[PDB]
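Replying to the earlier thread about multi-chain prediction with a worked example.

Input:
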Amino acid sequence: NDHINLKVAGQDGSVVQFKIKRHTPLSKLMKAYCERQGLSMRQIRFRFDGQPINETDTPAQLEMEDEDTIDVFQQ
Amino acid sequence: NENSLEIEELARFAVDEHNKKENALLEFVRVVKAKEQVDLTRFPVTTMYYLTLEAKDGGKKKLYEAKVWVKGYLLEELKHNFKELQEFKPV
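Result:
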């Protein structure tokens, strides 16, 4: 039950969903999204509810819910 | 999302596999919708693709839902990844 499904929505209109553990640091998700897409990480920014996401932040700490969306765009 | 060429490739795959397994002759037309779900909680990391595609069944255009499973999550590996059609049905 410690699993959560998050939508990662890019500026290009793409959406990729991720199943992750709620106490896993979100850096794993962010790194997976960049690797999958072929993106360089230095460029892009992840936002949740308009705010930035620390690499160490976890879904539990941010009170994320199943099917919430993470926005991603480049600087 | 649904008009990317990797999605089109998996859609054709789903249609081709469905045609072999069922001895059918559906003809691929287009993808109308595609959800991509990467599962990071388990090994091996896998992706599930839920495809809504349009295919000709004897001149009639119909809508189908397919589930395609992939043993991989990097797009750069997708062409050579192991894949399975796990579900194909009219929506």
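The longest strand of chain B covers residues 27-39.

Feel free to reuse this layout for your own posts.
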